[PDB]
Amino acid sequence: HNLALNKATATSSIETAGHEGDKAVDGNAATRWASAYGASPQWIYINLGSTQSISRVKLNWEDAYATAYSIQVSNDSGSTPTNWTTVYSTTTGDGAIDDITFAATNAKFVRVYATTRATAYGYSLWEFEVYG
Ligand SMILES: N[C@@H]1[C@@H](O)[C@H](O[C@@H]2O[C@H](CO)[C@@H](O[C@@H]3O[C@H](CO)[C@@H](O)[C@H](O)[C@H]3N)[C@H](O)[C@H]2N)[C@@H](CO)O[C@H]1O
């Protein structure tokens, strides 16, 4: 059960209309979030809507994937998280599907914080799935 499905999202940026964060959590492999281009970090987070115990994230990257990124959680109250905790990071991402597991943790928000690009574009996810 994908706890991210159709939850509210926010992003650091978007490439164009139609590439919003909601596109990464629609369960559709043919729609994607895509960030602005360039060498800045970028990110997408999901408001899970309630505290959930999570242990697994599945990323389905488009060709503009991150070689370096972290998965982070927040347990802030409200709808605007500001404190993040890294639960997993890599510097050797290889794109396509990334199936990530980590110690189960409470989380109200989950963020992909992407820091090194595989390409000279931005970063883009067809899907960002979250599992207990
Ligand atoms: N100089 C143009 C060249 O830019 C163009 O190639 C296309 O450029 C597209 C716009 O950057 C690029 O689309 C991005 O692709 C990445 C990676 O797949 C995605 O994450 C972005 O969302 C896309 N906007 C295309 O890949 C690329 N074909 C070419 C064709 O118009 O004309 C060149 O000479």
Side-chain angles (χ1 to χ4, degrees):
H1 302 286
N2 179 11
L3 297 169
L5 189 64
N6 298 312
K7 295 292 192 302
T9 63
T11 60
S12 52
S13 62
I14 72 165
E15 178 191 309
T16 62
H19 282 320
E20 305 83 3
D22 68 79
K23 304 295 181 288
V25 297
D26 59 8
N28 195 148
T31 64
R32 58 197 173 94
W33 173 59
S35 74
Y37 294 184
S40 173
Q42 302 290 168
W43 53 262
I44 175 164
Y45 73 70
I46 303 158
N47 183 345
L48 294 176
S50 70
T51 305
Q52 290 283 350
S53 177
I54 65 172
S55 66
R56 184 157 77 100
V57 165
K58 180 184 262 184
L59 302 181
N60 180 174
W61 297 97
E62 189 265 349
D63 308 41
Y65 68 95
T67 64
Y69 65 87
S70 60
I71 303 298
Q72 307 179 316
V73 303
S74 178
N75 283 284
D76 290 339
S77 58
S79 319
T80 304
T82 54
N83 303 291
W84 294 106
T85 302
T86 299
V87 301
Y88 170 85
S89 74
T90 187
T91 58
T92 64
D94 71 3
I97 308 306
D98 294 354
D99 203 351
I100 306 151
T101 59
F102 48 80
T105 180
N106 283 355
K108 203 202 153 152
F109 304 86
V110 189
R111 188 163 78 153
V112 174
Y113 186 76
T115 61
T116 300
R117 293 172 296 169
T119 74
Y121 299 114
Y123 302 88
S124 183
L125 288 159
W126 297 106
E127 288 292 299
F128 174 7
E129 306 176 0
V130 176
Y131 300 98

